[PDB]
Design a protein around this nucleic acid. Structure first.
Lengths: 148, 258, 100, 175
RNA sequence: CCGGCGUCUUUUGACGAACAACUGCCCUAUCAGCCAGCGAUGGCCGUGUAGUGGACUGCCAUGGCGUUGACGGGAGCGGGGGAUUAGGGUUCGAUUCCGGAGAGGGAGCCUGAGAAAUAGCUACCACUUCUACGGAGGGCAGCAGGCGCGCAAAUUGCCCAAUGU
RNA sequence: UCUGCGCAUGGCUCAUUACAUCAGACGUAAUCUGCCGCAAAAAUCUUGCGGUCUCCGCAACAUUGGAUAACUUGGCGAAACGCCAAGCUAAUACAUGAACCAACCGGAUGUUCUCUGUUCCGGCGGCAGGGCAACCUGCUGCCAUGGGACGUCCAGCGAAUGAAUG
């Protein structure tokens, strides 16, 4: 083999922790349709993996689909507000509230800063479903599961 | 770290007063939890009345005259939970504590055979060095485990002088159950359908004699036997039936005449 | 003779390790020679004041031990022998004594 | 007093939080270990379980492993060459996880001889096998490029791996 | 010959500890822009810690939040709950139980499974005690009891019998 | 007095303090955890006797080792929950250290010998002539499916790194 230049851009070398890429005469199968060796992970909670992730090119240590990040607790929805940054998208939510005295409703938003695997590329105004995670950054506490 | 318990932070099921000291005993870490159990000194004194006060209690206990599970227990405090057996030779009494209708602890009295018999649930199943399988329950490990291997949430039959394990019983439809926790405990029922919700609490649906069916979760369920003639252990005067508030009240009146 | 140290005119002890003819200030652990073991709790150390190794006129007393023994006897210490307070108690020791 | 918290930092809204509390031993940093080349020194500390850990200082000796041959054998770290965190660390000859360094090569060269009755085995093992040409030139010459995969400030040892085709070409082209 | 104690190492339960945040809460616009030199939002390899993380170093991007009230200021320990009341509500909660923080003001540290412990230690600032002037000390927002303050709040008692550690 | 355990709990007070605290509902597969419950543990050339060459022969229930307080002797200091020199002796303190008895399972190997090659075309060579040891020639041994015995080194719990299983 020889090395990419579109999966490499960094001073250090980009690789998956999980599996042996140095491989070699490959002892298998573990690998993805059929292709060089790769690690991919079937998370439960009734979600089913992307086709894309399994067969992918990409190197990510934060997605639950090719790394040891585990999705566990709360499960949320929302829509998309802004595609900025690198792998970090921004969710808006909207929901109501009730004041007992008036007996009328009221509108409120929150927002969250979540992780998006390079497997997906969802556009502003799309729905999404996400999952609970351990802290991956200062704000970031969720990671995408599934787009709509 | 907390070493003190108080009378207003202690359960209602022990039936201590607001008054008469502001402190209650904090039982140690042990076979059972702090939020359900009955500690030793609470049993002896406030129930069986062989102690009138604190000093009395330890003047029994510390001489090794009280034995849960065939092992004499010196300590003043030490918890005793659901499905244990307390044997105090000197009297000729034996107890098997249990829950009973109205959610509150109860005391049965058992003879020879069942003073050596117990039951244990299965919480988890895991593997240890040398590929030796292991189980874990409320009280303790114990090792391997055939009677024939199987699976979590199931219920065993354990003998205390030596292991003679009669069989075991499983969690499957048409079987029988007694309950813990959940403000639904002290009842008994069948097992209809068990709903499974992944990543989340698992919900059961039950039944009991002469209908009035109900529901609970699945970690509040503890199996008993295949059927209600197949039970290994004895049960209180009530068979785990709730009856209506009005019925109860009325009956208490009518019989009070004496 | 040899030297071992003693005290100042304030009763502050002399230390081997310190070099100066003068009083200084140092942290002193429980096991060390300026702070006693039974004073304070475990792990504890205190700031004390205590005198250097080098001698000067400020010494009030000094202690020493006979090494080489000369002519005239030093009275009541080389002319008096005092036996051990207590005998051995340990098995193996009692045997090693009598050589039995 | 070195702390690990978000208390001293700003909000996401650019505001500033006000404290009501001192600082704890629950939050706790300790000053970096810088682990160089030289005879083994160790500086043991104690953690919050009553479990020691070993701050390493100066490690000249190593343990390194082929992938694909499924072995590990010793060697002696000679020089540090490339580090991707800083060029600072290079020049000082300090050692951190995923640093690229140079090794003795000898024990590997040795062992690959063996890859009486033995005379049959040296055929059977050498069959169904080749060694990379990338790897070859290096291994011959008497020095190799290897990578330390241990963290040698909290175990007080360096351990590593060894570089075959993909990884190896990505490093060489820097140099 | 038999029994009761005691202790090193390993494994996992509950007695605990630490960390994370889905939803909610007074007044103020005569507070409208707030966040990056000194990390602000994110990315990559590391370092540190019991562990996760801009927690921190190096390097690279330009993001993050806000009229559905940011940022700033004023009042305030939070909750279970109390008073009043047909009903809708208004108002109070320092104080028995639960959670948090503190021990003259600040900081740093040791021991230990667990503490940034103050009837533990070290230093400085403010206050203060004893002295043969060479030095050595103190911390009641623990119980009694003083002094000052203010419209205003108790004995320098008796006892481990009960209830607990 | 040494040793082991506890004093981080209980008490008292609201000064600071609004993605701060807190309540309801969840999470730790991101972690530590003494006392308590229940359950495990097959590693290690040690000791005595006799001789001596350092190393052996002969036995088997380990007759282990070195210190320090209280106490005594001199004391110092105005005071101080301040302190010093010397002489005594303990351990569940502190420091060493246990063969055979005592098992199951796997690795790596010997120019070990004996079932054997039934087995040649190639390999490993071993020699001489030309030998520049390129090779050509002639001569010669063994191996080209294997297994039995004997010998040597390694093997436990826990921890680190790299492969493989899950």
């Amino acid at each position: 083999h020889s090395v990419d230049l579109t999966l490499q851009h960094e001073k250090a070398y980009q690789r998956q922790t999980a599996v042996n890429e140095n491989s070699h005469n490959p002892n298998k199968k573990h690998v993805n349709m059929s292709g060089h060796i790769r690690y991919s992970k079937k998370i439960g909670l009734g979600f089913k993996t992307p086709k894309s992730a399994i067969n992918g090119k990409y190197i990510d240590r934060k997605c639950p689909f090719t790394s040891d990040v585990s999705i566990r607790g709360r499960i949320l929805r929302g829509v998309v507000h802004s595609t900025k940054m690198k792998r970090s998208i921004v969710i808006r939510r909207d929901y109501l509230h009730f004041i007992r005295k008036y007996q009328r409703y009221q509108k409120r938003h929150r927002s969250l800063t979540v992780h998006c695997s390079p497997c997906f590329d969802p556009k502003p105004g799309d729905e999404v479903i996400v999952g609970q995670c351990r802290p991956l950054s200062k704000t970031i506490r969720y990671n995408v599961l599934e787009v709509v | 770290t907390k070493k003190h318990l108080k009378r207003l932070y202690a359960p209602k099921d022990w039936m201590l007063s607001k008054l008469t000291g502001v402190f209650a005993p904090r039982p140690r870490a042990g076979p059972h939890k702090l939020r359900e159990c009955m500690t030793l000194m609470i049993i002896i004194r406030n129930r069986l009345k062989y102690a009138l006060n604190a000093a009395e209690a330890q003047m029994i206990l510390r001489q090794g005259l009280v034995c849960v599970d065939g092992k004499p227990r010196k300590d003043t405090k030490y918890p005793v939970g659901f499905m244990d057996v307390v044997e105090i030779p000197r009297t000729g009494d034996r107890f098997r504590i249990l829950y009973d209708v109205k959610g509150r602890f109860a005391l049965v009295k058992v003879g020879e055979a069942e003073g050596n018999i117990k039951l244990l649930k299965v919480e988890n199943v895991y593997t240890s060095t040398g590929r030796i399988p292991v189980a874990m329950t409320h009280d303790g490990h114990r090792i391997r485990y055939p009677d024939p291997r199987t699976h979590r949430g199931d219920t065993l039959v354990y003998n205390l002088k030596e292991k003679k394990v009669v069989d075991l019983i499983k969690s499957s439809n048409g079987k029988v159950v007694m309950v813990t926790g959940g403000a639904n405990r002290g009842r008994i029922g069948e097992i209809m359908s068990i709903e499974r919700h992944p990543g989340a609490f698992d919900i059961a649906r039950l039944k009991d004699a002469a209908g009035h069916e109900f529901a609970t979760r699945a970690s509040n369920i503890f199996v008993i036997g295949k059927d209600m003639q197949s039970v290994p252990v004895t049960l209180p005067k009530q068979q785990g039936l709730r009856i209506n508030v009005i019925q109860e009240r009325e009956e208490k009146l009518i019989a009070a005449e004496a | 003779f040899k030297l071992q140290g003693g005290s100042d005119k304030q009763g502050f002890p002399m230390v081997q390790g310190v070099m100066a003819p003068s009083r200084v200030s140092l942290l002193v652990k429980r096991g060390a020679v300026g702070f006693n073991t039974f004073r304070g709790y475990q792990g504890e150390r205190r700031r004390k004041s205590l005198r250097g190794c080098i001698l000067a006129s400020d010494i009030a007393v000094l202690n020493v031990v006979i090494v080489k023994t000369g002519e005239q006897p030093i009275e009541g210490v080389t002319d008096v022998s005092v036996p051990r307070r207590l005998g051995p108690k340990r098995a193996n020791k009692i045997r090693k004594l009598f050589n039995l | 007093g070195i702390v690990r918290s978000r208390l001293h930092k700003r909000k996401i809204t650019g505001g500033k939080t006000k404290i009501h509390r001192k600082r704890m031993k629950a939050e706790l940093g300790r000053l970096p270990a810088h682990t160089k080349l030289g005879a083994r020194r160790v500086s043991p500390v104690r953690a919050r379980g009553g479990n020691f850990k070993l701050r390493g200082l100066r490690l000249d000796t190593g343990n390194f492993a082929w992938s694909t041959e499924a072995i590990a054998q010793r060697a002696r770290i000679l020089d540090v060459v490339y580090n991707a965190t800083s060029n600072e660390l290079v020049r000082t000859k300090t050692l951190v996880k995923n640093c690229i360094v140079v090794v003795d090569a000898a024990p590997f060269k040795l062992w690959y001889a063996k890859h009486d009755e033995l005379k049959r085995k040296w055929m059977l093992r050498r069959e169904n096998h080749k060694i990379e040409k990338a790897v070859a030139d290096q291994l011959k010459e008497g020095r190799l490029l290897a990578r330390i995969t241990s963290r040698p400030g909290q175990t007080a040892r360096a351990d590593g791996a060894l570089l075959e085709g993909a990884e190896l070409q990505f490093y060489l082209k820097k140099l």
